Amino acid sequence: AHVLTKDMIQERIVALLESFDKVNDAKNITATANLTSDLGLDSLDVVEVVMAIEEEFGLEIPDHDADEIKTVQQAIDYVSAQPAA
Amino acid sequence: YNAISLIIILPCISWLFPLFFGRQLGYVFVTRMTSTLIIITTLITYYYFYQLLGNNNPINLELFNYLNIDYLDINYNFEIDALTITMLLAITTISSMVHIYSIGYMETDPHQVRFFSLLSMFTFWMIILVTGSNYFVLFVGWEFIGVTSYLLISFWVTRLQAM
Amino acid sequence: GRYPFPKDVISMTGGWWANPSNWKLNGLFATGIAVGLALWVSTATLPYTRRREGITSESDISKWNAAAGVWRERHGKISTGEA
Amino acid sequence: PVPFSAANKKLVTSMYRQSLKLARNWISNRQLFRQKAVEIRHKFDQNAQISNPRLLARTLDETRAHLYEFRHPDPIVPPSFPGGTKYERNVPPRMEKIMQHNLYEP
Amino acid sequence: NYKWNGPLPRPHVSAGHRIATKFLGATMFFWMFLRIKEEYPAMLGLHNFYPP
Amino acid sequence: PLLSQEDMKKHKILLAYRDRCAALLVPLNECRKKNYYMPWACGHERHEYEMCEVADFQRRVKAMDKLKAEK
Amino acid sequence: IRASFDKAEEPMLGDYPDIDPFPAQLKNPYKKYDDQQDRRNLEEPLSVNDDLYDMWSPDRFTHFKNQDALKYFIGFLTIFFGASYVATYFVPEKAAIPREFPYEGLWKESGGTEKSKAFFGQRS
Amino acid sequence: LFHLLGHAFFKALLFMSAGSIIHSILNESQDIRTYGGLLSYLPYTYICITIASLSLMAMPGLTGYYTKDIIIESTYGSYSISNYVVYWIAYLSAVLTCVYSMKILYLTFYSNPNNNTITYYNAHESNIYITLPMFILAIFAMFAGWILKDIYLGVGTDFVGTHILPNNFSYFDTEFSITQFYKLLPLISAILVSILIVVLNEFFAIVFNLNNKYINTVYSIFNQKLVSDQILNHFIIFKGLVTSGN
Amino acid sequence: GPELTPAVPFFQPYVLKWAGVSLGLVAFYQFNSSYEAKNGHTWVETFFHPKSRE
Amino acid sequence: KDPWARREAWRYQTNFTRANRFKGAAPGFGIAVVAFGAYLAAEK
Numbered sequence A: 001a002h003v004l005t006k007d008m009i010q011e012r013i014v015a016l017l018e019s020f021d022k023v024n025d026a027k028n029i030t031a032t033a034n035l036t037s038d039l040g041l042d043s044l045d046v047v048e049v050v051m052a053i054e055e056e057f058g059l060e061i062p063d064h065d066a067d068e069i070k071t072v073q074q075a076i077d078y079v080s081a082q083p084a085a
Numbered sequence B: 001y002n003a004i005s006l007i008i009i010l011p012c013i014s015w016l017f018p019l020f021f022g023r024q025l026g027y028v029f030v031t032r033m034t035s036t037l038i039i040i041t042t043l044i045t046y047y048y049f050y051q052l053l054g055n056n057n058p059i060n061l062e063l064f065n066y067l068n069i070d071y072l073d074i075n076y077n078f079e080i081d082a083l084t085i086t087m088l089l090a091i092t093t094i095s096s097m098v099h100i101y102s103i104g105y106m107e108t109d110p111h112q113v114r115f116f117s118l119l120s121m122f123t124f125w126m127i128i129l130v131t132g133s134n135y136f137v138l139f140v141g142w143e144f145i146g147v148t149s150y151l152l153i154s155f156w157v158t159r160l161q162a163m
Numbered sequence C: 001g002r003y004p005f006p007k008d009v010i011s012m013t014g015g016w017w018a019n020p021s022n023w024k025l026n027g028l029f030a031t032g033i034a035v036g037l038a039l040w041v042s043t044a045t046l047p048y049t050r051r052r053e054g055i056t057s058e059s060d061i062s063k064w065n066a067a068a069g070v071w072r073e074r075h076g077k078i079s080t081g082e083a
Numbered sequence D: 001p002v003p004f005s006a007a008n009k010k011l012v013t014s015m016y017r018q019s020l021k022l023a024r025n026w027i028s029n030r031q032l033f034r035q036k037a038v039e040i041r042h043k044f045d046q047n048a049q050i051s052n053p054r055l056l057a058r059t060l061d062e063t064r065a066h067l068y069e070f071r072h073p074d075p076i077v078p079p080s081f082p083g084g085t086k087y088e089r090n091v092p093p094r095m096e097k098i099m100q101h102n103l104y105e106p
Numbered sequence E: 001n002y003k004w005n006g007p008l009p010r011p012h013v014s015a016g017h018r019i020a021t022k023f024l025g026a027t028m029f030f031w032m033f034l035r036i037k038e039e040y041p042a043m044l045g046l047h048n049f050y051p052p
Numbered sequence F: 001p002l003l004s005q006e007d008m009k010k011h012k013i014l015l016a017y018r019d020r021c022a023a024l025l026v027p028l029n030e031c032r033k034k035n036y037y038m039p040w041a042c043g044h045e046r047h048e049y050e051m052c053e054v055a056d057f058q059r060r061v062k063a064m065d066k067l068k069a070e071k
Numbered sequence G: 001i002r003a004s005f006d007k008a009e010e011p012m013l014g015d016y017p018d019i020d021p022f023p024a025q026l027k028n029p030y031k032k033y034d035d036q037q038d039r040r041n042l043e044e045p046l047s048v049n050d051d052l053y054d055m056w057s058p059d060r061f062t063h064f065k066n067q068d069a070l071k072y073f074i075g076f077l078t079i080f081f082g083a084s085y086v087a088t089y090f091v092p093e094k095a096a097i098p099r100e101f102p103y104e105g106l107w108k109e110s111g112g113t114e115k116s117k118a119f120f121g122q123r124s
Numbered sequence H: 001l002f003h004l005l006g007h008a009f010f011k012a013l014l015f016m017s018a019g020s021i022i023h024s025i026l027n028e029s030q031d032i033r034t035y036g037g038l039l040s041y042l043p044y045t046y047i048c049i050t051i052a053s054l055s056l057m058a059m060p061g062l063t064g065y066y067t068k069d070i071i072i073e074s075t076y077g078s079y080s081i082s083n084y085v086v087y088w089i090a091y092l093s094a095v096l097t098c099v100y101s102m103k104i105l106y107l108t109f110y111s112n113p114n115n116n117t118i119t120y121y122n123a124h125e126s127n128i129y130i131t132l133p134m135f136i137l138a139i140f141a142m143f144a145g146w147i148l149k150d151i152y153l154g155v156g157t158d159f160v161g162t163h164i165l166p167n168n169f170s171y172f173d174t175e176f177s178i179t180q181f182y183k184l185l186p187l188i189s190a191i192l193v194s195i196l197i198v199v200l201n202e203f204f205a206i207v208f209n210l211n212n213k214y215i216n217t218v219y220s221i222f223n224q225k226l227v228s229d230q231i232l233n234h235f236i237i238f239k240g241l242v243t244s245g246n
Numbered sequence I: 001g002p003e004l005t006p007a008v009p010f011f012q013p014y015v016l017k018w019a020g021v022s023l024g025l026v027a028f029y030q031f032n033s034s035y036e037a038k039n040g041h042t043w044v045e046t047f048f049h050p051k052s053r054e
Numbered sequence J: 001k002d003p004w005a006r007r008e009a010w011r012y013q014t015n016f017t018r019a020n021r022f023k024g025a026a027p028g029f030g031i032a033v034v035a036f037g038a039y040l041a042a043e044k
């Protein structure tokens, strides 16, 4: 069938963030970058980004776990924690 | 070679043989075997339909007695007439196609022996339903297709919503 | 794909992805039994097969209806709607 | 009811996510979904700085009412999740040893 | 899946599937043309059976 | 010509088909028996039966016309 | 506590916890439970009518209230049937006479008898 | 009987084609809102589902035509006067049919992609075990009705020997008494509505994707099965369990 | 090609038991009917010795 | 106005243009016009 790898998840998230226009800079997006701090993403903007992530990997993030992810590495480890994605 | 007897008895084998011999055969053989039996049934049905359009003289198959109490005499009687042959055309054609389709569609599923036995079970009891010559045989088929529907809709047993 | 399953669980249906190593030999046995059963059934049920029409003659049908009329005249039997 | 607090943020963010989910559920066409999504973000932006308690509580109550008026009969869920068509299909068995119950009989 | 958020390549589809689609669509359109030609009057509604 | 009652019974016509036109129905069904009811066959017999039915339906529409005119 | 039938049992408990019942189907399914499928945790108290609120109970529908759904269902049936009945009035009349049959409606062919021709017998 | 036999074939084809579509998605989603560009990727499943839909819509020269249309016309030709109302009901159903068929045809194959990018990369056709039955049933759904119309709907066919009371039998009246308007209106309406639905989806999405509160309400009514399932579950089944407790 | 599970003997004890009993019953039925055609009565009837009605 | 307007471009580009999205919606139709014209010729 089809199986994703940690690096595939990372590459997809990085391209995703690169596509976002509200970001500060594209070159500054790291695996451990903070969207709130480094990318300067607003309160609602990080929500838009989590929604984009779930629309991209086909999963459903609860409210309590959505607001917990603050870094890109946090996003990647969450998306790799989920079996069907 | 008796068309009516084969039309009844071959889906019965495609139903029961997987339940008797599934652990010994495996789903590869079971899928191919059930599909082949249903195909042969469908072919026999098409030939019978051709002849019946030639000569509308239905075959009857009259077997042992069910009840012979005071005035009520019920027998395991079957006939294939125009109405029945139209039903059987639909039933056997769609059943053979669904059997072939399921080889591919269910290839990953762990429980394929049970699934194919149940599809064949449904075909057999529906054939019984339409070929019976009295309302009792009709009812026998009527209740058994309900049982089979229960077993099929709940095929994925661990799923609450399916149950 | 697949996943582990308990090997002690014995089901008549074979359980999980049942594909025995000797399945082709077992299939030969199963098909032989199937052919034997189908042919025995087809032959044994042959004497109980008959066609629907042209099995009784017009003589029998006509005379049976005549006798029933005789029976209904011995008793006092008017017809349905006959009043 | 704070004009700007962690609880207020959590609430408004949950709600804005709800709005975007709702809009995706209701609008079939992708282009128009992007239109309405942009407009939702604008509406969420305009009332961002409300400070006094009465007005903020009122705006929150009225947006809650708006959302409840626009609830969808059946949201889109991915199949492997609770509301999904594949949820709990073919759940792999727990691997587990046979506990005996009788001295003489298995 | 080399390209992301980018234009997609033309799908690769088997030759047999393309041929089968050709045959199915051609037979369907041709059969419909045949039937329309053969049943134009009755199927459109003509030659009224009422006396004039 | 209207078929005999004995003829109607002998050819085992269905009751709803026992009309002034069943005389044509008999050959049509014989051909539909010889050929296996195939659509391309029995064209002449089929058309003759249809024309007889045309005449019957026309007579009935004129009957309804007269009945309408009385009112 | 909430429904009339759970309230009616209130005299029937002495020293059993009066639990306010919630339909298991409506518990959010992203929380974690000891039995995920049943959405229950171990040692959780049961309402006296727990069998009507667990996961195996009949499904509950949230989008409309039950009363409003009843309104809509009755209204759909009412408008459909009333419209059909009313339409029956504004109907065109047919153009051909219903057909007829020799032998006084083939009363003999449909069984029938001289003395009983109204029971069996066509339009003739 | 003829409509039963004809409907079986193309209904089986529709369901098998849907199964193919579903297996062509990694998620294996069944939501028509989650597909959207698949015409290029699955041309054969498209053609099978298309043939089945046009058979259902009783398009000319197809098996569904020879069953659906004549059943629709029988109601007008029926001797019972009031039965005229049924005509209109049936006709509305017919056009309603087109509306959903086109809706699944467009939303699956024409619209614009609504799934994420990896699904379109991995979207492929199915194996032969799936494909061959669809081909066979496609042939059936094109040819069976025409090749069998004489057996079941023939001017005096004696094959099904059911004893219809002569006063009741009206199959001749429903052919001779039918006018052009009624014999043609379901067909034209089907064609026009199918084109209408497609063009309004591709050009005026607002009319379908409004946000009126009232229209959303009536849509919600229809989406939840004319709330029947709630009505059954609360007023009969749940009430019955409460009574059993009592 | 799918995987292979361990070989399993076709004729289990249950196969032998149920097939043997069923086929033996059918064989007995046919033997009784043939013995009836020849002898005049079923061979099972011969073991029936009720008291007379009188 | 769209800050994800970059992310959505691929949904309206080459395989998903109005020209491409409706290409192959009538498979075999040209073969059908040729065959119908041919049969019209041969029938007479």
Ligand SMILES: CCCCCCCCCCCC(=O)OC[C@H](COP(=O)(O)OCC[N+](C)(C)C)OC(=O)CCCCCCCCCCC
Pocket: B012, B062, B063, B064, B065, C041, C044, C045, C048
């Ligand atoms: C299993 C799928 C169906 C297979 C059918 C194959 C039939 C082949 C030969 C049939 C001969 C026949 O049935 O005869 C039946 C014979 C004599 O009947 P008869 O009056 O002489 O004729 C019948 C035809 N009439 C009437 C039209 C002329 O009495 C019996 O044996 C019944 C014995 C009952 C035994 C107890 C029931 C055991 C049930 C076991 C369930 C597992």
